[PDB]
From Swiss-Prot, chain D:
The VP6 trimer contains a zinc ion located at the center of the molecule. The zinc ion is not essential for either trimerization or transcription activity of the DLP. Zinc-depleted VP6 has an increased sensitivity to proteases. Belongs to the rotavirus VP6 family. The N-terminus is blocked. It is found in: Virion. Intermediate capsid protein that self assembles to form an icosahedral capsid with a T=13 symmetry, which consists of 230 trimers of VP6, with channels at each of its five-fold vertices. This capsid constitutes the middle concentric layer of the viral mature particle. The innermost VP2 capsid and the intermediate VP6 capsid remain intact following cell entry to protect the dsRNA from degradation and to prevent unfavorable antiviral responses in the host cell during all the replication cycle of the virus. Homotrimer. Interacts with the inner capsid protein VP2. Interacts with the outer capsid glycoprotein VP7. Interacts with the outer capsid protein VP5*. The chain holds residues 1 to 133 of 397 of the full protein. Residues 62-73 are annotated as: Interaction with the inner capsid protein VP2. This is Intermediate capsid protein VP6. Transmembrane segments: none annotated.
Amino acid sequence: MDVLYSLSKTLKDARDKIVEGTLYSNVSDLIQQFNQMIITMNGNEFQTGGIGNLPIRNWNFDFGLLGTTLLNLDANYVETARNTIDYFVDFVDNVCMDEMVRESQRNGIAPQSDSLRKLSGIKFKRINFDNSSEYIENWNLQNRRQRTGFTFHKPNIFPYSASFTLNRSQPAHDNLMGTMWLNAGSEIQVAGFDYSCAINAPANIQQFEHIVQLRRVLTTATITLLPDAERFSFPRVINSADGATTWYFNPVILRPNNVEVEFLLNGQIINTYQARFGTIIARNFDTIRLSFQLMRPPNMTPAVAALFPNAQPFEHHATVGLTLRIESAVCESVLADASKTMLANVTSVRQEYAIPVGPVFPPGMNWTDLITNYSPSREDNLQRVFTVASIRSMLV
Amino acid sequence: MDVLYSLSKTLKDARDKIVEGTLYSNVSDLIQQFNQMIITMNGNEFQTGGIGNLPIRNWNFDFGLLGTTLLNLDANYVETARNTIDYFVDFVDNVCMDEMVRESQRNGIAPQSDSLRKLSGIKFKRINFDNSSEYIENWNLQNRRQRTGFTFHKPNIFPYSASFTLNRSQPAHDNLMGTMWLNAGSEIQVAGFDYSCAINAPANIQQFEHIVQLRRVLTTATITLLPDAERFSFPRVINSADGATTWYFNPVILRPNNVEVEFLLNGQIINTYQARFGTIIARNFDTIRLSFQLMRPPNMTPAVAALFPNAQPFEHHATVGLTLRIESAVCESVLADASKTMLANVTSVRQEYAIPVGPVFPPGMNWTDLITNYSPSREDNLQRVFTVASIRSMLV
Amino acid sequence: MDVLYSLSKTLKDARDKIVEGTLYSNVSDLIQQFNQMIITMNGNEFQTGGIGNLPIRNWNFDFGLLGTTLLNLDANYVETARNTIDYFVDFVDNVCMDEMVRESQRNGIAPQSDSLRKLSGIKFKRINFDNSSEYIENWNLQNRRQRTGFTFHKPNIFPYSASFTLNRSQPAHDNLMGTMWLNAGSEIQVAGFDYSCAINAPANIQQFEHIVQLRRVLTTATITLLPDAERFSFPRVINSADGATTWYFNPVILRPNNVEVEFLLNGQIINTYQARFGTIIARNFDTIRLSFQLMRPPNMTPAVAALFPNAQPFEHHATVGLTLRIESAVCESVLADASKTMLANVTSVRQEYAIPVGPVFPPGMNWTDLITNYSPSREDNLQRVFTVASIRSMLV
Amino acid sequence: MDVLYSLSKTLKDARDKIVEGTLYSNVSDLIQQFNQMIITMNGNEFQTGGIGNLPIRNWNFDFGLLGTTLLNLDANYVETARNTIDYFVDFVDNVCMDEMVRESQRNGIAPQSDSLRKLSGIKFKRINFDNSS
Amino acid sequence: PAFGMQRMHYRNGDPQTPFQIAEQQIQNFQVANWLHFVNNNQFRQVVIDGVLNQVLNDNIRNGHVVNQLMEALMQLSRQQFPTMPVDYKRSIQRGILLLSNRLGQLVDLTRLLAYNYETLMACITMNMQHVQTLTTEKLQLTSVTSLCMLIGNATVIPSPQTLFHYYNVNVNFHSNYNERINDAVAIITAANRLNLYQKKMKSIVEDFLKRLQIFDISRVPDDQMYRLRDRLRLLPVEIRRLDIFN
Ligand SMILES: [Cl-]
Ligand SMILES: [Zn+2]
Ligand SMILES: [Zn+2]
Ligand SMILES: [Zn+2]
Ligand SMILES: [Zn+2]
């Protein structure tokens, strides 16, 4: 991985720095690294692609080196380097694609393709140089087993889940009490509804709770908490629990009461925020516990009093809500996120070449299934393919 | 850890090989390694701390090298070596104890005692030699991020839980349908009971299902599956789910029908066994789904028909069972088993010196609580303490 | 086999002993053996896989020797040795997997994979060194036709069979006399039941006999014999012999009378135990004869006398039992047991790669089918694959 | 701040660029900067404070220079550099944490922790290099 | 012998040199890395101001690679030489150390040689074409030992007047070469267009070779003479001479 990353980085630096008119002092070290790469790859035969529709490609390297004494690079030097750069870029792109389309239950972190396995030989270690990207840095630290993490903007940590729970119900679904939530990406919208508006509840307070377990520990996370769940704020017709029938929801939004957000790690309360909205910080957690309450307004204007009678029928259903968006976080494991394109790259490569479904990843690289069952083996293979995808995107 | 294990291994080899009359050619390399250990440890001051009732102990090393002059070892050589080995064994045992009684939430895999932290310096790397034990091998593999493996005989993977679920129940507990299970150690006994004997079932079949989620992935597991559950096959008086009353269970054992044992990994069926009893192999799994059925006998002899009437009262309650024992398995994470004494050693050391409860382990070193909430921090600390326990048991 | 085992053992020793900082005197002989391995394997082409989903893999060996002079091993030496060891370990793992998934009716003890057949040439005999494992030791001894012994904890010697024999029966199944047994793994539960409680039997004694023929001779066997068979001591609705109907069993357990356990070899009484319960030793046997009597209590209290009327109906059925557990044994032939993982390893390798059912082993490597028809060819193939599995387990 | 940033940047560059097998031309300037940092920090005592539950930590610097004279960096070089880098990274992280938890009403832009105040002396200005973030 | 390896049975005509085989066959990082450099240190080609130039690796120019050499042979001084007589082994190791302990002098020598090469190569006007010549220049390795063991620290660089003289000689030779090519081409083309079928281009080619001042025409193979005739025939005439001929 480090050798493949070094190949890609050398080629990117060759494209960027080997330009017409540049001082040779600007590229002396880069030219040395490029010539080392040519020297190491020369005389080696590579084969990439025998899986799905990825065609069998054979790579031979017999390229000449680059000059080292001129003062300023000219068009001749760049023309000489460009053909080698193109061939090497094609080779690296195909190696990255070959590695991205492979998985193993036993050793998912080890190279799977024949080409990357050959590049793990000792003789290719000479190609290795600066490993400065975030993903390669994490790769090396994690190989050494050092505390390292990835920074995500809008981490895709919650598998899709639109569900409801009815604590009070009956076959006619006319006097209900419960919670409905959407868990999607970095967003949690939860809404606790009481059809009776807590007329008969003790102290006229009804308590709703929502517990979300994250499949990986998020650290140094910035969260936006808002007191309304706009997703569950309009009339809906909702399938029953078993799909036997449909029930009617007619929300009237009351502000949530006694809002408490607890960020817990292994059942230990790490962060607690009471009646706090806006930006909050969750330093280290794997579980989110949202506790809110519906309180009857002790004083109601005539229209408000008309909304909530003493007994049934209940035509307007009192709802409180919360919205929790993870703006950014840090996680020791790789995740899909709104900023990076690693998951998109891997999925695109797998789909374009009809890669047969393996024994590790869900078919079609579905992220909801992947994050629902994010096992250590899946984490290993996902880190491998994501690092390869970043390496490839460095050039392609 | 590798240096501490190397010290313990050197001392064990010295005890085993430095015997009266033995040829020096049988100990030449061992004597060289022992003298290297003497040189490395000489001039260093160590302290084993006073956590709990462990006495604070100070260790100084000013030992002369072992001789190299005798063709065959004699009594004097053995006695001198015995004195030195006794001091070193005391030091190593105290260091191991000091490490076992410590835990950290942040970095549990790193050394916690100051002695082992000092032994992790570069100057002590000379002491390092053959790492052939299973636990040290796995430690080294983990440090390099390689596929680890611990082979357990009767792995203690199921936290103790004797519970029941009543799918059909009533206040008088005379027409019940449900399941009762014991998941203890490597054993799962489950029993589905129907008081009506599926008289009113849709096809005279009552389906029972038990899902046991393993806390860690198990591989290469030999499993004995037997039809009946002897534990839930005799009359019982069982507290109600809320403890408000007691109900009577009067089983009559019927053969389980359509037995499907599924071993699942990430929700995917890795292994399936239909009506197969005896020894089976689950190659890789983290969940067990046992599906069985109580089928009303289509034909009954007069006594059998007498047991099961068409309506209440139901004095004899039909029951099907299943027993599942994990004879052996392989797990990437450490576990307690019936063969190794690592958990017993750690617990004994903690109890002997009255170590105060830490922030990681349960407040008895209780295995049920530990394996229940087997967090990654708990796993790291458990691996550390178990490796140190094996190192200590090499000597003590 | 010996060459493959020697490769695996050399690689295991290299992993365990070639560590940073260790004295070169600790590995001098090991380094010489490693260099001999390199010299012998250099310039040879190997191919593995091609059966089932096991992928085709080509191996070419061109590695330099380790000849650097040092007092203590450093990072450079360890890294070079690590690269070589990684390649060799991958090769050995693939060879072991290839050999495990193959069988032949004729000469199943001989190598099946072309890689192992090539490794069986004379030119590779140089790789051979210490053969200390139990399985390789037995392999070499059997090649020399010396007595071989595999020591098993809870040997899997009895194929699963839950059966019954009715010596007296009738269509109503209300006055039955017979025996029901479970022979599973190392456990034999047997229960002789008489519905009449020997009211009309000669001397009010009924005699039950259970003969169990072991498929292979067991020696130095430790057995635990217990009076009661808890599996056949609760009410039970059992199928008819031909499944036409179902009969009812309502045990009342009487202690077995005149218990004789005979361990026979070629029909000759080798060991005899009379009214002896607890731990017993069977030094050499291939058949077990459990003979026990149900004796009607000459004197009964009114509660006891109520259970056994002179004539029918017989609501309570007298039952005597015996439980026999083989805790440990020694067998010349290989077997599954509760402490080892070779059967599990072979089954996992065959299931993972979808190996087609061969001409020797039963589908899915069902142990019950294998041990039921444990033919000499099956024994040879099983020994081969188990030895290869142990060799692989040394590394993977 | 600039000296602390330069320490962190040098350590990050050392971790990224000092890898087994890499040409020494890829690290010549980096090795010179790292040796300059070692020389500047050697012989200096630092203490990260005990504010709150943050532990009091004492840091002493006595490290040898990173070697030259390798065409391609080998495993021994990387191991020695990793030991030094680990100690320096731990020191830098602790200093950053100590500075992050302190504040003043006036002169709040100036360093607050004793470690960063010491690092703001003239004798440490040698450590300063590229400030690109 | 240092690493206890079996002596190489090198087969002449092998596409690999002995060092290329030893690089793969030797596991020690110092010696293997030095061997890798030695294997891959061929001249690089670069066109400067329209002149092809054979340039050295930047590690040769700065002399840094000598460190690696030192490293490698320092490892050779520590080796056991398993089956070598100890007196001969000691002599070899002490010679290896004789060369090793001159690391600074050899770095200076490498930098000086590379600098002199670059400076005098700046004064070359004709393409530095690399071909394997029929006859070689014999280099005594005792002279290499003398240079390695006697070089001090006195830098010597080409004098500006020496550089100008070298450049002038190169320019004069190149200009004369081109002018004589032009004359030969013009006369050959004129004879052909004048239909002088009895004119012998061999005499023209001999005069052309004589005017180059560095060829003993009596020793020019006939096939090469006729090849030169053909190549001269294929060239186009120079503008001034062609206009005069028109
Ligand atoms: Cl057991
Ligand atoms: Zn509903
Ligand atoms: Zn109940
Ligand atoms: Zn029957
Ligand atoms: Zn056991």
